[PDB]
Amino acid sequence: AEPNAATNYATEAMDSLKTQAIDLISQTWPVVTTVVVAGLVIRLFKKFSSKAV
Amino acid sequence: AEPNAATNYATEAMDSLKTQAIDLISQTWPVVTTVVVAGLVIRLFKKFSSKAV
Amino acid sequence: AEPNAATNYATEAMDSLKTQAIDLISQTWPVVTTVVVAGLVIRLFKKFSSKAV
Amino acid sequence: AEPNAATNYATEAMDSLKTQAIDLISQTWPVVTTVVVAGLVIRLFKKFSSKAV
Amino acid sequence: AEPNAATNYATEAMDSLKTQAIDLISQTWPVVTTVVVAGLVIRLFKKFSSKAV
Amino acid sequence: AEPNAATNYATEAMDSLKTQAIDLISQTWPVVTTVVVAGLVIRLFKKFSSKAV
Amino acid sequence: AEPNAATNYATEAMDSLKTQAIDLISQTWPVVTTVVVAGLVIRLFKKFSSKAV
Amino acid sequence: AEPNAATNYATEAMDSLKTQAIDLISQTWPVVTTVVVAGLVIRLFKKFSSKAV
């Protein structure tokens, strides 16, 4: 009753904070994917210079 | 009798606060599991760039 | 009646404190967004030096 | 009224702290730009020695 | 009549104590704003050292 | 009158505490500036060793 | 008696937290073992390219 | 006599609280020892990948 109804409202804002934290981390994934675009494209250019040496 | 019946009602709300605190901490575990989803997925992308270097 | 009308006035100042606390935290979000502007711009400069090494 | 006028004065010092934090980070950008001047100039000297080898 | 006129004089000093307590808390807001000037300026200096590391 | 003159004397010591708290935080800024002198000078020495490697 | 029986119940939850922390770290070991599977398999591929050069 | 006999009973529960606090901290030591088992075993795996690079 007393802590049961209090944990019903608390669980509602906790699951909206779980879904919106998964959205914020979904903006993190494409940013580190673009950092790996600089790593793979620049390091393939280093393969151009080393292979011609 | 007097503190015995008073501690019967007090123990009832204390065990409902124990069960509902275990539920609130059960919303905490999947939120830190999603923080470890950003740590393991982003750090495996850092393994992509470092291994190509 | 007595605690009912007292909780009507108390709830009025509690919901104005909820809306104005959401406004104060809305000034917090763009300040930590500018801290992430220093993290992403400075760390992309560190990607310039490390990629040329 | 009560939390509304309090959040008007609080928002005024919060937006002066946002503008002055953007100025402090604007001193950070040219310092990491000079660190990339040591990385690109020194690493172009390493390209001089490696290309003559 | 008797408690009605007594509560008229009591309410007069209660509303002057409400307005002057809002003035005293208005001296509190700029003092905690200057504490946040030390937090944001000093912590932006910590961003200078950590970004150069 | 009664809380009005009381808040006149209270505001006088509150604004002297605001000015003298700004002076104490002005001793804090040059101390964290010297901590950033150790961070930038020591980390430029780390740029000497890493660039020679 | 008083702190002795209190430390009996406290030690019971402390040894269940020791065994379950050893289980959580046992999920950590195979995850870093798979990170060493990427290090040894990818770095043996780098031995293929360097040995043919 | 009066505070002397009162401090005899108080010292008895204080030394049982000293011995049982040393027991609770003795459950703390093996838990941080297992945290150092994850640090030394996982960081020796990082020595496997870095040494093969």
Chain D: closest CA distance from residue E2 (Å): 32
Q: Which of F18, F22, F32 to mutate to test the interface with E (most CBs of E within 10 A)?
A: F32
Cβ atoms of H31 and G25 within 8 Å: the answer is no
Using an 8 Å Cβ cutoff, are G25 and H36 in contact?
A: no
CB distance D31–F40 less than 8 Å?
yes
Structural contact between residues C42 and E44, judged by C-beta atoms closer than 8 angstroms = no
CA distance E44 to C35: 8
Q: How many CB pairs under 8 A join D and F?
A: 7
Instruction: Tell whether D11 is covered by a domain.
Output: yes
Chain H residues with CB within 8 Å of chain G CB: 13, 16-17, 19-21, 23-24, 27, 30-31, 34-35, 37-38, 41-42, 45-46, 48-50, 52-53
Place of tokens 């000034």: C27
Rounded to the nearest angstrom, the gap between the alpha carbon of residue H33 and the centroid of all alpha carbons in its chain is 10
The CA-based diameter of chain B, rounded to the nearest angstrom, is 77
- How far is Cα A25 from Cα A3, in angstroms, rounded to an integer? 32
Kindly state whether residue A27 falls inside one of the protein's structural domains.
yes
Amino acid at A31: V
Distances (CA, A) of D11 to C24, C28, D21, F11, F19: 7, 10, 15, 22, 21
Instruction: Give which of D25, D37, D41, D42 to mutate to test F binding, by max F Cβ within 10 Å.
Output: D42
G46 located within any domain: yes
Query: At what angle are helices D2-52 and F2-52 packed, to 10 degrees?
Result: 10
Distance CA F41, CA C11 (A): 56
- Measured between CA atoms, the residue of chain A closest to residue C48 is A38
Domain count, chain A: 1
Which residue is listed with tokens 């930590």? C32
CB C42 within 8 A of CB D32: yes
Q: Which residues of E touch F21 (CB under 8 A)?
A: 31, 34-35
Q: How many CB atoms lie within 10 A of CB F38?
A: 10
Closest CA to E32 of F13, D20, D10, C31: D10
| Burial readout G8-42 (b: 16 or more C-beta within 10 A, e: otherwise) | eeeeeebeeebeebeeebeeeeeebeebbeebeeb
Q: How far away is chain B from the Cα of G42, in angstroms, using its nearest Cα?
A: 7
| Spatial contact of C38 and E45, defined as CB atoms under 8 Å apart | no
Chain breaks in chain C (C to N over 2.5 A) after: none
Å between C13 CA and nearest CA of chain E: 14
Residue F1 lies in a domain: no
- Identify whether H39 is part of a domain: yes
F47 lies in which domain range? 7-53
| Chain A CB contacts of B50 below 8 Å | 39
Handedness of CA G33, G35, G36, G40 (dihedral sign): positive
Contact exists between C and H (3 or more beta carbon pairs < 8 Å): no
**Sequence-separated contacts (24+) of C10-14 with Cβ below 8 Å:** C13/D2, C13/D3
- How far is the alpha carbon of C48 from chain D, nearest alpha carbon, in Å? 7
Which stretches of chain A are DSSP H helices? 2-52
For chain C, the 3-state helix, strand and coil shares in percent, each to the nearest 5, are 95, 0, 5
**Considering only CB atoms, which residues of chain E are within 8 Å of chain C?**
40, 47, 51
Dig out the tokens for E48 from the structure.
């200078």
Identify whether E25 is part of a domain. yes
Structure tokens at C32: 């930590």
| CATH code of residue H30 | 1.20.5.80
| A3, B17 Cβ separation under 8 angstroms | yes
Structure tokens at B6: 């008073």
DSSP assignment of G3-52, as one string? HHHHHHHHHHHHHHHHHHHHHHHHHHHHHHHHHHHHHHHHHHHHHHHHHH
Rounded distance, CA G10 to CA G8, Å?
A: 6
Q: Is residue E2 part of a domain?
A: no
Question: What is d(CA B26, CA B28) in angstroms, rounded to the nearest whole number?
Answer: 5
d(CA D43, CA D30): 19
Q: Distance from A10 to chain B by nearest Cα, in Å?
A: 8
d(CA E51, CA C25): 26
Chain H residue numbers with beta carbons less than 8 Å from the beta carbon of G5 are none
- Asked whether residue E18 is assigned to any structural domain, the reply reads yes
**Which chain B positions have a beta carbon within 8 Å of A36's beta carbon?**
45, 48-49
